[PDB]
Design a protein around this ligand. Sequence first.
Ligand SMILES: [Mg+2]
Ligand SMILES: [Mg+2]
Ligand SMILES: [Mg+2]
Ligand SMILES: [Mg+2]
Ligand SMILES: [Mg+2]
Ligand SMILES: [Mg+2]
Ligand SMILES: [Mg+2]
Ligand SMILES: [Mg+2]
Ligand SMILES: [Mg+2]
Ligand SMILES: [Mg+2]
Ligand SMILES: [Mg+2]
Ligand SMILES: [Mg+2]
Lengths: 97, 97, 25, 197, 214, 91, 127
Amino acid sequence: PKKRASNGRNKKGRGHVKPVRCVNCSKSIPKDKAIKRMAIRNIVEAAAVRDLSEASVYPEYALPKTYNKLHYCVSCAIHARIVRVRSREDRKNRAPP
Amino acid sequence: SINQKLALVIKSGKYTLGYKSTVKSLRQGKSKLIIIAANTPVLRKSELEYYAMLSKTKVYYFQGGNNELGTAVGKLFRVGVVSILEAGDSDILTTLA
Amino acid sequence: MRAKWRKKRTRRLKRKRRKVRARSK
Amino acid sequence: SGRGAPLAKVVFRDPYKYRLREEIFIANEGVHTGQFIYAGKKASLNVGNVLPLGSVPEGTIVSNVEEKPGDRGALARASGNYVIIIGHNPDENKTRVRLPSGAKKVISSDARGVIGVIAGGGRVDKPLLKAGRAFHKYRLKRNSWPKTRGVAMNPVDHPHGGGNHQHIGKASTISRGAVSGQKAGLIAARRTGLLRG
Amino acid sequence: VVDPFTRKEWFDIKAPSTFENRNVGKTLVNKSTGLKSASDALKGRVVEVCLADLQGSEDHSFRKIKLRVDEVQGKNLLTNFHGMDFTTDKLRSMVRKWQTLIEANVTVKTSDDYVLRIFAIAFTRKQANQVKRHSYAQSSHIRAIRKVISEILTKEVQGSTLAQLTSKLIPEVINKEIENATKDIFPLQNIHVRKVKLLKQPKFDVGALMALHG
Amino acid sequence: AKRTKKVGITGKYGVRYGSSLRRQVKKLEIQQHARYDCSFCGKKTVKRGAAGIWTCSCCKKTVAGGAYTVSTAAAATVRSTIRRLREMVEA
Amino acid sequence: SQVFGVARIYASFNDTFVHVTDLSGKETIARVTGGMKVKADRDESSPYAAMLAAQDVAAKCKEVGITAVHVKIRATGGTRTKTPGPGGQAALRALARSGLRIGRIEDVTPVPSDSTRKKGGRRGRRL
RNA sequence: GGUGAAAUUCUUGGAUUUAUUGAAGACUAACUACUGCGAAAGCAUUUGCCAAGGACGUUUUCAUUAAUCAAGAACGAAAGUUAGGGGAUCGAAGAUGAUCAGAUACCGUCGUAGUCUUAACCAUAAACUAUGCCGACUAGGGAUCGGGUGGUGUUUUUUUAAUGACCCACUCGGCACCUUACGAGAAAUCAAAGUCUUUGGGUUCUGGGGGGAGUAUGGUCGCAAGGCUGAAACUUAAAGGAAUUG
Ligand SMILES: [Mg+2]
Ligand SMILES: [Mg+2]
Ligand SMILES: [Mg+2]
Ligand SMILES: [Mg+2]
Ligand SMILES: [Mg+2]
Ligand SMILES: [Mg+2]
Ligand SMILES: [Mg+2]
Ligand SMILES: [Mg+2]
Ligand SMILES: [Mg+2]
Ligand SMILES: [Mg+2]
Ligand SMILES: [Mg+2]
Ligand SMILES: [Mg+2]
């Protein structure tokens, strides 16, 4: 039977979207079906900040952040526990948190 | 724009087509405008300005060869030069184009 | 037997059947 | 005759006495009779003109390029061939070019070339279909045709000759230092076999 | 054993006058001698340095500047502006979803024969009181804004000799000009040149370099 | 009436030399025997006189072109590149 | 008051480079890699190998005159992971430990406009 | 370097790593979304040129010119074929290093074809919304794209004119979504898959248990690969769909 109304993807009005490559295994993925996450990390840590504040010129200069959009194939997102397989009623929920 | 002005002269005004009749009309002072095909040879073309400069009549340089100019004046042959004897319901003489 | 591989194998038999026939012809 | 590319007869006025001098250029594609050619350092960048290499931009396509300034054309003369100006070296003026064979050459910037590609291109695209067309092609060139295979000969005639079967018997790759009478085969071959990396 | 660090000379990098404090840093070279003298081992060096460092003010924490050494006098390497570029974390923090990114670039020559490509970036902005959540331009605004930006960038360059372009780039008066000339088409928030790359160098003009390095 | 199905002009070669070779010749012979528009007098009167020589039967103008066509694509690309660089020089 | 160099920490997976240069980057000063500090081939990219490989870099920066460093952290980039390896953080912390001053940390991972198709096949690297 | 761990491979002749400068070919990240356009296939850097198109607006024109369509045609991913060009990358074949009982697989490093383009072919995909097209009607809601209409509604520019952008309220058209189950369905589910034994709006295509078999044969198209058309003898009590408990 059919599992999802939005079959497994987000494409109603295209036919063809574009492929993207999985960051974990390089699998080719339609861009709308890819599981996308936004990793915003401190350039150093959550614990070496005090060390870098003590041992650096420019007191509390910037603490720059690292931005990268990750694209995951279905298999790698499930095996990395990014999407966490859900129940029939709970998979209809599109809320992030 | 230029083509529809040409079509209006052919429909409403009076005109002559071809080298010999154009030069005769340039001699007789009956020409208000000369349209010159792009691929008209340079000797004939300079001959046409020299005649036109003598009679103080405007020269417009058609963009397109004698096939295109013949089509523009509504003909099924090439015309390398057209002379406008008098504009009819057309503003071809008043508009700089 | 996957359906596309059975199709491929059947294309191989057909491709060689049309060669033995042309040979015997 | 014997040349694939057509020739342009270009008439110039002699600068030093009242008379006309004629020249035999190799016509570049797009050059027509009655066209004005301009040949000089101050010539325009138009097909057919003859310019020094140092006074044409990057990526310019020229033909009949001088190997040395004044030799009157050595490079890219066969139909459809051309030289690409790939760089300038203004101090001790040199121009880096790409030859039809793909080699990178350094020519003096004062050597001349003709803007455009040698006309008659695509000729070898048409198969000859038959010996007779090769006969007439070489009747106008030289006595290089037909060719008898060395293995088809006798040992007195060719190093490939002899044997109770037609075969070569030793390697066809011959050293560069072999002497005349030995250099039949693939001379100084760095590799052999179908070109397939 | 070699230990090449008992062999080099520790030169000092100087910045063009169109900045704050011109003391940038130090460069290690060699000990000069015959047989490939160390004098030529510098004339092409390019050093990136933050505009915040060479201006003192921290509001220039992004937008690093490339300074290329032109010649060597004494224990001093005189640098000239070689390029400008925003930092990566600045770009990435600036690109956000539910908005439009507009980018324009122009290749343009200065009053000098300095050929250089100017880039520019801008982002559609939500108006105050806006309820809709994505603030996108209508692709006619985008060409309108891009046409405005290109014209402004071409106008700011073609005067503004390299020294004047740098003195224009530091206080970001160009982005006030872009904003003033685009505020009607569509509101924008993060308007920046974001990059300058020099494509072709004019005559070396040692006098011009000395006009910046006193 | 359609006298041949596919050989066309290359039916003069009968059954010899191979169909692929005859097809290859056929494409280039049709090009080399075609009439082309004159860029000078605007008439379709340009015929080949020899490989690389294209002569307008009127206006007597002769141009140098491809072995089997008046203009080769390489020649067209070289024309555009030369024009582009010329305008860069003249800009 | 201080003399600056550049740390240029390349933190891939399976290795980490601590490559201090001058400001220009033309002159290397103490390039030490994680593979130098361990012999197991499992942990060249480990934080401990990075700790040791940045400790001896800074022990070399001193006695040569570099007292402060601008840090450029790098991932493999191109068509690869884009995520800084485990060793990059230990190497940065090791530089701060070692008395070297720090200024202007930045990430310089080469990020294309997607280009030059990624290795692995269409179905990806499946194990 | 590479991996889970390694080998293979490069490396004191300097590998990897740093910097400056080039060359080539491909791709067009982020922005990029339950958003857009296209007949579908598909289509994402700028700018110019060219022809086209939907929707909207309309107190313009024509006046049945229309719907669907055997035959007949144009287009039609990728792979593949031919001949040039290009050939950075990745990479059916192949090589090689591993793993294992074996591994001619997965993993590693290379690597021809191919990947790109031009001129021709081919005509097939889970070419899918697995949902023919045209028309009408049956329920509530909010968001969104394009056009329009209306607010003594905000906002910048001279302080506010306007315009833009935004807000609100309507309206046509569109991609969708949410709730409910009128109603439908075997159910999953579905605003169409509803207005069906209370069975008829128009029209095209296709199916008739599972295999044999999309096989054989003939025809036709194609350079080929193959495509379209397409049985039977024989064999069989199931095959299958959806859901439930384990
Ligand atoms: Mg299932
Ligand atoms: Mg599709
Ligand atoms: Mg022979
Ligand atoms: Mg014999
Ligand atoms: Mg982009
Ligand atoms: Mg859009
Ligand atoms: Mg039909
Ligand atoms: Mg089908
Ligand atoms: Mg179907
Ligand atoms: Mg839509
Ligand atoms: Mg039945
Ligand atoms: Mg049946």
